[PDB]
């Protein structure tokens, strides 16, 4: 009696150019970005410009680097926390 | 030279303002012509005969003035006698020409009065007229026309056609200017020590306003000196300025004590003088800083997480001095500014982050929005707006508010669609940038995207059958709230379901890359136990925990064993189990445990759990035989922990946001002084983080010590940007 | 303007006229200065008829011929009392 | 709106208040308690008085030059006496 | 000394006429001075007293000569004082010339009227000559309004600052003469064309300065202008033709005015002031 009756398949999406390759990781595109690990987690948050940003670095460094390190665009600030 | 045997009948009757025919006065012009044409002395006697006939009238007028003994009869008799005489000073001296306006006969009329009899009459006119106002100022109902008539007389007694500052200026103007100032300076002691400052100011203001009304009566308003203004200057200096130091001394008392009735006159008078209103602005500012911190030094740091307790105590502090201003100063914009500037030193003792958590209680389906009606919810949001207008740390409000808006929309847990939309105008009334104002519109569009992506899969792919799968693909910020990217073991029905959803979007919707959170996905599992049937609607973490339970609900499993069965770390299993063993406001729990705990942290690797064999949906405290129970609770939200994890960010923002503004300002301000930087910071930080200089000074300097901003080799207070 | 009198019998009314104006305009110029409308009244030029109005050819109202020292005469059959000379004798001191 | 100036010969000279009120006494009279009677001034004198009034007002706003106003030798004596009732 | 320059101006034949001397014979010195002295017209000293700004001797004498004053021209006097020059220049230009004076104070203009009446009443030379009665207005001579016109012969009776000299230079018509004691430098300013000017020195003088405008944010500045350009009164009109009538007759009969004026069929109370200087 371990069968399921319903599942809400909850996830987020983020902008990129294509879903076959990854410029910020070396892993499946659906996992955490490796740039925050191998190139030093990948907490990816949405902004007003409709390009996500890494919220474990902007929470400290947005004062100097108000960009989206995981995209190709500058960041327009909306959320700086959880 | 005293021989107007034919013309006195007209001149003497006019001098007394008797009825005289218009023709007779007109004919007088041809009679004085006849006098200079048909006489022996005409050309020489006309102006001397005028003097002698005037002199006789003037002496008679003196008797008809000075013979009176009362102040009213003495003053009025002169006024009547003069008004008759002066009226004719523009009529009788029209004829009588070519005898040397500026005629000799007019000069003789005006000068004969002043030289012959005014040498003694003017001291009694001033003494009586001064006594009138001296008594009138005490409430004696004197005839105000007596000092008006003297005013009219003395401005008319001036005979110089080029410089009329004479009889009136000396025998009246100064006497009233000096005597009224002395009167009020010597009257003030009757109130200075006998009553309160409020009641003194009532006397000072009442006497000044009444004297102003009198000033426009007895002080020539068109005089070449504006005596009225000069009087008001000496009167307000006699009444208010001589008391200003004590009027201000009790401003700290009245303000600190919230004596809003006694500040009524305080505002009316002190708001008129920059050197009185400003001390009061600093007195309110300083008392708010001292009184505010006396309460906030505890409230801010001992309440921490209770948003209703903090904000109501912050509103208690806010209302204590906002009520003071709203009453004492009629909601004044300068005392609100002094209030707002004061709180910038207070409310950061570390920040009013709970204003946004309190808003979320007002904006989310919480008891605060269930026990209040729509007007009360909007009223409380307006009260927060009045608070937020002064708060120095505003990005912590947006930090929480925007995180809360995101989670409210994606979970469909908002108090109302209209309440969410009202925050768009609410933030525009605050004055926040569009980047934050329109977050609701951005989330609304993102909800549509999720629904369109959901149907895109459900209508094409049909792992768990698609009829039991509901996909929700939100913006990156919807779920990316933690670094703990934990993924949990699941039965085949779910384990082989996500890869298909992922591959669908990889090829059917290029670019939109998914990222999954097993803390957020949820589902339904059917159970039977020893009392009835039930369906658990729980998160995917909980589904994996239930999977361990599904085939063995009566077998005791250790915390360590669940960790191994589900592949969860301590943090997620402690939170996951809590929602099953200690769910809030639940009559019967799903999972049982033997140890006593206080919180999720107290679950140890040796802790044993089991499934509650009496669990089911409970209605009115009655056990049901079938039903669906949702135990997701706060797992899809942010628990109290949110403050513990965000507190570090709140501290970081206390420096970050200022230095963000500085770096941005310095990019566009290549070389500026600290005073220019702080000036720019006020404008940039107004919607983020604008403390008092007691924090800024260090924050601008720290960018020098840590080698972020360059400074002038010859001026440590001028910052230089490079590149 | 040009000195112009409106005269009849023993009444002399001191008015003016504009050099560039027609007799019809002058009826309104005189009306303006005198407040007497042209109630079936025609303006003259030193007794010149000037038609019944609205004419220019005869309206020789040049200020050089109608200066303040020398008024133009307007007959309000005309009858105007002239100004007589002083009926004075040499009287020794003023030979004539 | 004119002031009527009565000559001793019974002749009536009608001069506008603007035209008459160009000197002192004429302003001094009447301006208080038009008609002005010159019982001593014949019409052959008062005519030049009235024409001088019209002359004065018409040139009260002149530019540079002011024309001469010729007077007959037999009336100047009485014009001066009239002047002492008007100037 | 400055005598050589004054002689050079005379030797240059700039005056030529005797009209200037006639004004000095016709107008009695001192009858324009203050009653407390009635003497300084005959002495060289400080002539400024109270509001009286005249200087009958060398100072005004050179002004009368500095202006050629062809008869019939229009005279403008800014700083007219009591009318000393305005009357005597009016005599030089003809009894029926144009003489429009302005002075700073109404006390001295009021006195100027007293002096003109006193001269006609009690002077010694009145009954011999024709005279021009000048007009006055009161106002600040340095505040010239856009309603000003042009004049032929112009004099300033009080000290002028060089930086403001244009307030009257602009008022001179081509071919005229403007004389001003500019910072106590008395100069002869001539306009020879539309934009061509020439000037000569006259005399080193001593004047009381005009009161420099200091008003702001109101309608005093440049709102005084020149005296009303208007026809004079009737007493002066008739009085001049009375003197012409008698003078023109005796010019032929000589081929005493005091006695002749006694037989005019006019009462003595009038003739005594009007003609006879009270004998």
From Swiss-Prot, chain A:
- Stretches annotated zinc finger (RING-type): 33-72
Alphabetized UniProt keyword annotations: Acetylation, Cytoplasm, Metal-binding, Nucleus, Transferase, Ubl conjugation pathway, Zinc, Zinc-finger
Q: Name the positions where Zn(2+) 2 binds.
A: 49, 51, 68, 71
Q: Does the keyword Zinc-finger apply?
A: yes
UniProt: Zn(2+) 3 binding residues? 33, 36, 42, 56
- Localization: Cytoplasm; Nucleus
Catalytic activity field:
S-ubiquitinyl-[E2 ubiquitin-conjugating enzyme]-L-cysteine + [acceptor protein]-L-lysine = [E2 ubiquitin-conjugating enzyme]-L-cysteine + N(6)-ubiquitinyl-[acceptor protein]-L-lysine; S-[NEDD8-protein]-yl-[E2 NEDD8-conjugating enzyme]-L-cysteine + [cullin]-L-lysine = [E2 NEDD8-conjugating enzyme]-L-cysteine + N(6)-[NEDD8-protein]-yl-[cullin]-L-lysine
Observed effect of gene inactivation = Embryonic lethality at 11.5-12.5 days post-coitum (dpc) due to severa defects in vascular and nervous system. Embryos display impaired endothelial differentiation of embryonic stem cells and angiogenesis.
What family, per the record?
Belongs to the RING-box family.
Full protein name: RING-box protein 2
Native species of this protein? Answer: Mus musculus
From Swiss-Prot, chain B:
The record describes its post-translational modification as: Neddylated; which enhances the ubiquitination activity of ECS complexes and prevents binding of the inhibitor CAND1. Deneddylated via its interaction with the COP9 signalosome (CSN).
Q: Is the keyword Coiled coil assigned to this protein?
A: no
Q: Name one GO biological process term.
A: SCF-dependent proteasomal ubiquitin-dependent protein catabolic process
Q: Which residues carry this modification: Phosphoserine?
A: 19
Crosslink Glycyl lysine isopeptide (Lys-Gly) (interchain with G-Cter in NEDD8): position given as 667
Where in or outside the cell it occurs: the entry states: Nucleus
Which of UniProt's keywords are assigned here?
Host-virus interaction, Isopeptide bond, Nucleus, Phosphoprotein, Receptor, Ubl conjugation, Ubl conjugation pathway
Residue span, Cullin neddylation domain: 654-715
MF term (GO), any? ubiquitin protein ligase binding
Question: Which InterPro entries does the protein's record reference?
Answer: Cullin (IPR045093), Cullin_CS (IPR016157), Cullin_homology (IPR016158), Cullin_homology_sf (IPR036317), Cullin_N (IPR001373), Cullin_neddylation_domain (IPR019559), Cullin_repeat-like_dom_sf (IPR016159), WH-like_DNA-bd_sf (IPR036388)
Any one cellular component term from GO for this entry? Answer: Cul5-RING ubiquitin ligase complex
Q: Which Pfam families match?
A: Cullin, Cullin_Nedd8
The outcome of changing residue 653 to D is:
Impaired interaction with ARIH2
- At the top level of its lineage, which domain of life is listed? Eukaryota
Q: What is its main location?
A: nucleus
Q: What is this protein called?
A: Cullin-5
What's the name of its gene?
CUL5
From Swiss-Prot, chain C:
Q: Which SUPFAM superfamilies match?
A: Ubiquitin-like (SSF54236)
Identify this protein by name.
Elongin-B
InterPro entries assigned: ELOB, Ubiquitin-like_dom, Ubiquitin-like_domsf
Q: How does it assemble?
A: Heterotrimer of an A (ELOA, ELOA2 or ELOA3P), ELOB and ELOC subunit. The elongin BC complex interacts with EPOP; leading to recruit the elongin BC complex to Polycomb group (PcG) target genes, thereby restricting excessive activity of the PRC2/EED-EZH2 complex. (Microbial infection) Following infection by HIV-1 virus, component of a cullin-5-RING E3 ubiquitin-protein ligase complex (ECS complex) hijacked by the HIV-1 Vif protein.
Gene Ontology cellular-component terms listed: Cul2-RING ubiquitin ligase complex; Cul5-RING ubiquitin ligase complex; cytosol; elongin complex; nucleoplasm; VCB complex
Recite the UniProt keywords alphabetically. Answer: Acetylation, Host-virus interaction, Nucleus, Phosphoprotein, Transcription, Transcription regulation, Ubl conjugation pathway
Q: Pathway of this protein?
A: Protein modification; protein ubiquitination
Q: Which GO terms describe its molecular function?
A: transcription corepressor binding; ubiquitin protein ligase binding
Q: Where in the cell is it found?
A: Nucleus
- Keyword Methyltransferase tagged: no
Pfam families in the cross-refs: ubiquitin
The UniProt similarity line reads: Belongs to the Elongin B family.
Which Gene3D superfamilies does this one have? Phosphatidylinositol 3-kinase Catalytic Subunit, Chain A, domain 1 (3.10.20.90)
From Swiss-Prot, chain E:
- Chain spans, region AdoMet binding motif: 76-85, 151-155, 172-182
Q: Which family, according to UniProt?
A: Belongs to the methyltransferase superfamily. L-isoaspartyl/D-aspartyl protein methyltransferase family.
Query: What name does the UniProt record give this protein?
Result: Protein-L-isoaspartate O-methyltransferase domain-containing protein 1
Region called BC-box, residue ranges: 231-241
Q: What gene codes for this chain?
A: PCMTD1
Q: How does it sit in the membrane?
A: Lipid-anchor
Naturally occurring in which organism (per UniProt): Homo sapiens (Human)
Q: Which PANTHER family match?
A: PROTEIN-L-ISOASPARTATE O-METHYLTRANSFERASE, PROTEIN-L-ISOASPARTATE O-METHYLTRANSFERASE DOMAIN-CONTAINING PROTEIN 1
Its Gene Ontology cellular component terms are:
Cul5-RING ubiquitin ligase complex; cytoplasm; membrane
Q: Which GO terms describe its molecular function?
A: protein-L-isoaspartate (D-aspartate) O-methyltransferase activity; ubiquitin-like ligase-substrate adaptor activity
């Amino acid at each position: 009696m371990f069968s399921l009756k319903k599942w809400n398949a909850v996830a987020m999406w983020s902008w990129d150019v294509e879903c076959d390759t990854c410029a910020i990781c070396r892993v499946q595109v659906m996992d955490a970005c490796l740039r925050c690990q191998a190139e030093n987690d990948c907490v990816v948050v949405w902004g007003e410009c409709n390009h996500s940003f890494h919220n474990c670095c902007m929470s400290l460094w947005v004062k100097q680097n108000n960009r989206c390190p995981l995209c190709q665009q500058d960041w327009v600030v909306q959320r700086i926390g959880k | 030279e005293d021989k107007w045997d034919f013309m006195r009948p007209i001149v003497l009757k006019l001098l007394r303002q008797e009825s005289v025919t218009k023709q007779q006065w007109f004919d007088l012009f041809s009679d004085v012509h006849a006098v200079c044409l048909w006489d022996d002395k005409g050309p020489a006697k006309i102006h001397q005969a005028l003097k002698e006939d005037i002199l006789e009238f003037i002496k008679q007028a003196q008797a008809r003035v000075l013979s009176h003994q009362d102040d009213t009869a003495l003053l009025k008799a002169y006024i009547v006698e003069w008004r008759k005489f002066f009226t004719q000073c523009d009529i009788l001296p029209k004829p009588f020409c070519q005898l040397e306006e500026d005629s000799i006969v007019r000069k003789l009329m005006l000068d004969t009065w002043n030289e012959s009899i005014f040498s003694n009459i003017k001291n009694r006119l001033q003494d009586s007229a001064m006594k009138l106002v001296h008594a009138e100022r005490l409430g004696e109902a004197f005839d105000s026309q007596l000092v008006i008539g003297v005013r009219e007389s003395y401005v008319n007694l001036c005979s110089n056609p080029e410089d009329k500052l004479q009889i009136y200026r000396d025998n009246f103007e100064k006497a009233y200017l000096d005597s009224t100032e002395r009167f009020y300076r010597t009257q003030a002691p009757s109130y200075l020590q006998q009553n309160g400052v409020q009641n003194y100011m009532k006397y000072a203001d009442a006497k000044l306003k009444e004297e102003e009304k009198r000033a426009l009566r007895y002080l020539e308003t068109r005089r070449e000196c504006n005596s009225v203004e000069a009087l008001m200057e000496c009167c307000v200096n006699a009444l208010v300025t001589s008391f200003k130091e004590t009027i201000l001394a009790e401003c700290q008392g009245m303000i600190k004590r919230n004596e809003t009735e006694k500040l009524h006159l305080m505002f009316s008078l002190m708001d008129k003088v920059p050197n009185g209103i400003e001390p009061m602005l600093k007195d309110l500012e300083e008392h708010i800083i001292s009184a505010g911190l006396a309460d906030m030094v505890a409230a801010a740091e001992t309440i921490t997480t209770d948003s209703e307790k903090y904000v109501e105590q912050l509103l208690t502090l806010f209302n204590r001095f906002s009520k003071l201003v709203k009453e004492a100063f009629q909601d004044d914009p300068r005392f609100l500014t002094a209030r707002d500037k004061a709180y910038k030193a207070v409310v950061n003792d570390k920040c009013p982050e709970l204003l946004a958590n309190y808003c979320d209680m007002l904006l989310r389906k919480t008891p605060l929005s269930k026990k209040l009606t729509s007007e009360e919810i909007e009223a409380k949001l307006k009260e927060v707006l009045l608070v937020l207008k002064y708060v120095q740390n505003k990005d912590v409000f947006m930090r929480y508010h925007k995180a809360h808006l995101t989670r409210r929309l994606i979970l469909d847990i908002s108090a109302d669609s209209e309440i969410e939309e009202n925050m768009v105008e609410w933030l525009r009334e605050v004055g926040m940038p569009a980047d934050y104002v329109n977050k609701l519109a951005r989330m609304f569009q993102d909800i549509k995207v999720s629904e369109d992506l959901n149907q895109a899969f459900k209508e094409m792919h049909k792992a768990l059958p698609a009829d039991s799968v509901n996909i929700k693909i939100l913006n990156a910020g919807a779920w990316s709230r933690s670094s703990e990217k934990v993924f949990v073991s699941l039965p085949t029905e779910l384990e082989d379901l996500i890869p298909e959803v992922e591959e669908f979007y990889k090829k059917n919707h290029y670019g939109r890359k998914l990222h999954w959170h097993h803390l957020m996905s949820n589902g339904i599992i059917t159970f039977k136990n020893e009392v009835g049937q039930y369906d658990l609607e729980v998160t995917t973490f909980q589904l994996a925990v239930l999977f361990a339970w599904n085939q063995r609900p009566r077998e005791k499993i250790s915390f360590e064993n669940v960790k191994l069965a589900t592949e969860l770390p301590d943090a997620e299993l402690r939170r996951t189990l809590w929602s099953l063993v200690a769910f809030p406001k639940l009559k019967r729990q799903v999972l049982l445990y033997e140890p006593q705990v206080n919180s999720p942290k107290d679950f140890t690797e040796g802790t044993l759990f089991s499934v509650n064999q009496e669990f089911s949906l409970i209605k009115n405290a009655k056990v049901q035989k079938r039903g669906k129970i949702n135990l997701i609770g706060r797992l899809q939200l942010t628990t109290e922990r949110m403050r513990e994890e965000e507190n570090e960010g709140i501290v970081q923002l206390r420096i970050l946001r200022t230095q963000e503004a500085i770096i941005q300002i310095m990019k566009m301000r290549k070389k500026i002084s600290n005073a220019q930087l702080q000036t720019e910071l006020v404008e940039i930080l107004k919607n983020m983080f604008l403390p008092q200089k007691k924090m800024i000074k260090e924050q601008i300097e720290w960018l020098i010590e840590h080698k972020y901003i360059l400074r002038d080799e010859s001026d440590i207070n001028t910052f230089i940007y490079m590149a | 303007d040009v000195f112009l009198m409106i005269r009849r019998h023993k009444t002399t009314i001191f008015t003016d006229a504009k050099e560039s104006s027609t007799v019809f305009e002058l009826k309104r110029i005189v009306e303006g200065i005198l407040k007497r409308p042209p109630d079936e009244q025609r303006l003259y030029k030193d007794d010149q008829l000037l038609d019944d109005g609205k004419t220019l050819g005869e309206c020789g109202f040049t200020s050089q011929t109608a200066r303040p020292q020398a008024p133009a005469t307007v007959g309000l059959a005309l009858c105007i009392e002239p100004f007589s000379s002083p009926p004075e004798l040499p009287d020794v001191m003023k030979p004539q | 709106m004119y002031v009527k100036l009565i000559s001793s010969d019974g002749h009536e000279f009608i001069v506008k208040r603007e035209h008459a009120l160009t000197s002192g006494t004429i302003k001094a009279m009447l301006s208080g308690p038009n008609e002005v009677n010159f019982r001593e001034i014949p019409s052959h004198v008062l005519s030049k008085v009235c024409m001088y009034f019209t002359y004065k007002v018409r040139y009260t706003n002149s530019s540079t030059e002011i024309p001469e106003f010729p007077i007959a030798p037999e009336i100047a004596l009485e014009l001066l006496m009239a002047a002492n009732f008007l100037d | 000394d400055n005598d050589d320059l004054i002689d050079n101006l005379k030797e240059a034949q700039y005056i030529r006429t005797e009209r200037v001397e006639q004004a000095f014979r016709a107008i009695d010195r001192g009858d324009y001075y203050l009653e407390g002295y009635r003497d300084n017209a005959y002495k060289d000293l400080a002539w400024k007293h109270g509001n009286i700004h005249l200087s009958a001797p060398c100072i005004y004498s050179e002004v009368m000569e500095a202006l050629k004053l062809q008869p019939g021209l229009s005279f403008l006097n800014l700083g007219s004082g009591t009318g000393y020059l305005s009357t005597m220049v009016g005599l030089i230009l003809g009894p029926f010339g144009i003489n429009h004076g302005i002075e700073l104070h109404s006390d001295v203009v009021e006195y100027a009227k007293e002096k003109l009446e006193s001269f006609i009443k009690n002077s010694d030379s009145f009954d011999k000559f024709e005279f021009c009665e000048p007009a006055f207005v009161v106002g600040n001579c340095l505040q010239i309004a856009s309603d000003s016109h042009q004049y032929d012969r112009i004099y300033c009776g009080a000290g002028v600052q060089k930086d403001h000299e244009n307030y009257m230079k602009i008022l001179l018509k081509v071919g005229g003469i403007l004389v001003m004691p500019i910072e106590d430098q008395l100069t002869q300013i001539m306009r020879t064309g539309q934009n061509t000017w020439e000037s000569k020195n006259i005399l080193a003088v001593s004047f009381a300065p005009l009161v420099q405008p200091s008003k702001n944010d109101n309608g005093k500045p440049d709102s005084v202008g020149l005296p009303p350009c208007a026809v004079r009164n009737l007493q002066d009109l008739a009085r001049i033709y009375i003197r012409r009538t008698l003078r023109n007759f005796i010019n032929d009969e000589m081929q005493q005015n005091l006695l002749r004026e006694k037989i005019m069929k006019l009462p003595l109370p009038e003739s005594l002031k009007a003609y006879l200087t009270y004998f």
